[PDB]
């Protein structure tokens, strides 16, 4: 739903890297090159960003219960 804080396998913080990952993808960088630029080295950490599905953006489309 939202990018997890800390990779499950090791615990390196990957929560701060999702927006930068998306920006680098918009730049031109391939997924692997963006992951390298963000500093993700082990395939455990690269799995976190590479396989992440951001559903929080879809959930934010619905109007809040209390405004």
């Amino acid at each position: 739903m939202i990018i997890p804080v800390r990779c499950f396998t090791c615990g390196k913080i990957v929560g701060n890297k999702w927006e930068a990952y998306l920006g680098l993808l918009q730049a031109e960088y391939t997924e692997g090159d963006a992951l390298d630029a963000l500093g993700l080295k082990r395939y455990c950490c690269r799995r976190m960003l590479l396989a992440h599905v951001d559903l929080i953006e879809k959930l934010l489309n619905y109007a809040p219960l209390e405004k």
Binding site: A63, P64, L65, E66, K67
Partner: protein, 44 residues
Amino acid sequence: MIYICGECHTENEIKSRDPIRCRECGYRIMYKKRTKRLVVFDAR
């Protein structure tokens, strides 16, 4: 208590044994609204 409206999201206070209809919108779905007492969550 005070019930938040389903559609117009305006709090309306409905007494017991009163029909569930929001004033100014007429929607028939209300929500009870969060409790004042606070619950401790362990971050774990």
